[PDB]
Swiss-Prot record, chain A:
This is Spike protein S2. The chain holds residues 696 to 744 of 1273 of the full protein. It comes from the Viruses. Precursor of the fusion protein processed in the biosynthesis of the S protein and the formation of virus particle. Mediates fusion of the virion and cellular membranes by functioning as a class I viral fusion protein. Contains two viral fusion peptides that are unmasked after cleavage. The S2/S2' cleavage occurs during virus entry at the cell membrane by host TMPRSS2 or during endocytosis by host CSTL. The gene is S. It comes from Severe acute respiratory syndrome coronavirus 2. Glycans are attached at residues 14, 22.
């Protein structure tokens, strides 16, 4: 059976906050298709030659 | 569940239910046939 994610319990309390002290500059890739191959079919030639 | 007066019982999972669903989620699953 698959595991959805690693378990993480956030330590919530009514008077505690977590503040970041550092940062990471992260570059991520996103690949998106834009166009396809432009295909034309001669219907008469394809069916009958 | 001390959230400064905010109540989330209707949306948090119900421990009593075997499916571990919220009351709203349980209602949604019941209303779909
Ligand atoms: C802020 O404090 C809380 C509580 O003192 C820390 O939460 C604990 O983290 C340890 C390490 O993973 C766990 O073993 C404990 O079970 C956590 N406690 C609770 C109540 O969840 C928390 O890690 C602290 N934050 C930082 C950045 O150190
Ligand atoms: C914030 O994180 C960066 C990591 O990018 C820390 O930079 C590193 O600092 C150590 C200690 O001087 C060096 O050995 C590493 O080579 C540094 N890494 C890079 C990429 O420069 C930075 O020191 C951290 N700052 C704080 C305040 O924690
Ligand atoms: C949050 O809301 C829940 C549900 O709206 C409250 O639970 C109700 O409590 C009363 C008083 O004991 C019962 O008569 C109801 O039957 C309970 N409803 C359900 C659905 O169990 C709850 O008291 C509210 N407050 C907190 C702090 O959880």
């Amino acid at each position: 059976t698959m595991s959805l994610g690693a378990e993480n319990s956030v330590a919530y309390s009514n008077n505690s906050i977590a503040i970041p002290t550092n940062f990471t500059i992260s570059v991520t890739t996103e690949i998106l298709p834009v166009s396809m191959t432009k295909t034309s079919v001669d219907c008469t030639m394809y069916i009958c030659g | 569940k001390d959230f400064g007066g905010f109540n989330f019982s209707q949306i948090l999972p119900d421990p009593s239910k075997p499916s571990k669903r919220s009351p709203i989620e349980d209602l949604l699953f019941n209303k779909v046939t």
